Amino acid sequence: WEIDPKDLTFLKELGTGQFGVVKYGKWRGQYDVAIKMIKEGSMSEDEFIEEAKVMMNLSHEKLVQLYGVCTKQIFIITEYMANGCLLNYLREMRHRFQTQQLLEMCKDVCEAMEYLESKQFLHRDLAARNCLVNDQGVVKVSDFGLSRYVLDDEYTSSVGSKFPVRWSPPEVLMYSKFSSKSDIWAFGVLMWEIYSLGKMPYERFTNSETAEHIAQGLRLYRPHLASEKVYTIMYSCWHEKADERPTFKILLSNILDVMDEES
Ligand SMILES: O=C(Nc1cccc([C@@H]2CN(c3ncnc4[nH]ccc34)CCN2CCO)c1)Nc1c(F)cccc1N1CCCC1
């Protein structure tokens, strides 16, 4: 798990956020890595460190690979994803995506989430902004579980000003009821983000208005590029009743069937 920071060569900035700075680098002169440099005071680092052991055993081809941690200082060393943030990827209209490509990004994500669900592991913050894209156009799930160590309460509480209201089911917004089925809800919103080419969910609403809308039964409506069958899959994620929402196993079966049918 422990990486010697001396084996790292820093090369380029990839991205900055509230919790850290990610740089493109090499490990022992040769191997491409992303180095996540945690900002001092953003993170419950000693809690994270014990968690990093269960995370070092999470391994799936659609899950951004954790390589290790540098904890004698603090850095997280992960798989480098050359096409970067999925949300930015979706907004680049130059890709001129076929709907078959969009459905494949949904499947990549669903495969990752099916694996996490198999391990009773919650993402807790599934959204396009937390997916990455590799050099072969493969989507992988990133930053799964890490919100649990974020010290800023504007990010972590449901009433917080940086909480992911637009990816949260009513039982989360009302009661803080987090479950496999809040990830299923989030996944539905993600499929919407993909098929909308990276529009903000509830584009015309505030987070306050989104929460009021969701509570009354308002839903995201069908993106132009989504077929009726694709829309049926994303909408199935948004049942008012958590126990009426599919598993990730059932969602992956649904996506595969539409891939075969071509909806
Ligand atoms: O701060 C992060 N991650 C982070 C920070 C900065 C940048 C990036 C990615 C980095 N980018 C990458 N480009 C290419 N290969 C890559 N591999 C890994 C990241 C990456 C290029 C795109 N960037 C997006 C910005 O444009 C991510 N995680 C995090 C944490 F350390 C501590 C606590 C919580 C969190 N989670 C909680 C929920 C969300 C964050």
Ligand 1 binding pocket, CB closer than 6 Å: 14-17, 19-20, 22, 34, 36, 38, 43, 64, 78-81, 84-85, 125, 130, 132, 142-143, 146-147, 149-150
**Closest alpha carbon to 189 in 248, 257, 237:** 237
Architecture of domain 1-80: 2-Layer Sandwich (3.30)
The sign of the CA dihedral 200, 83, 115, 75 is negative
Convert 108-142 to b/e letters by CB count within 10 Å (16 or more is b): bbbbbbbbbbeeebbbbbbbbbbbbbbeeeebbbb
129 CA closest ligand 1 atom index: 24
CB 113 within 8 Å of CB 248: yes
Q: Is 181 exposed, middle or buried (0-12, 13-18, 19+ CB in 10 A)?
A: buried
- The residue whose CA has the least distance to atom 18 of ligand 1 is 34
- The residue whose CA has the least distance to atom 32 of ligand 1 is 19
CB 76 within 8 Å of CB 14: no
Annotated binding residues for clofedanol, as ranges? 78-81, 146
From 32, 46, 108, 125, the catalytic residue: 125
> If phi over 0 gives left and psi between -120 and 50 gives alpha, with beta otherwise, what is residue 58?
beta
Q: Is 75 exposed, middle or buried (0-12, 13-18, 19+ CB in 10 A)?
A: buried
> If phi over 0 gives left and psi between -120 and 50 gives alpha, with beta otherwise, what is residue 242?
alpha
Considering only the C-alpha atoms of the chain, give the largest distance between any 2 of them, rounded to a whole number of Å: 56
36 CA closest ligand 1 atom index: 31
Sequence ranges of the domains in the chain: 1-80, 81-263
Annotated binding residues for dasatinib, as ranges? 78-81
The Å distance, Cα 50 to ligand 1 centre, comes to 20
The Å distance, Cα 125 to ligand 1 centre, comes to 12
32 is catalytic: no
Region 81-263: CATH code:
1.10.510.10
Sheet holding 66-70, edge to edge: 8-16, 20-27, 31-38, 75-78, 66-70
* Paired residues of 84 in beta bridges: 133
Runs of H (alpha helix) within the chain: 45-56, 86-91, 99-118, 153-156, 170-175, 180-195, 207-216, 228-236, 248-261
- Residue 238: CA count within 13 A, CB half-sphere: 22
Measured in angstroms, the resolution is 1.7
What 3-state DSSP class applies to 77? strand
Pair type for strands 31-38 and 20-27: antiparallel
Give the alpha-carbon dihedral of 148, 236, 201, 193, to 10 degrees.
90
Pair type for strands 75-78 and 20-27: unpaired
- The residue whose CA has the least distance to atom 9 of ligand 1 is 15
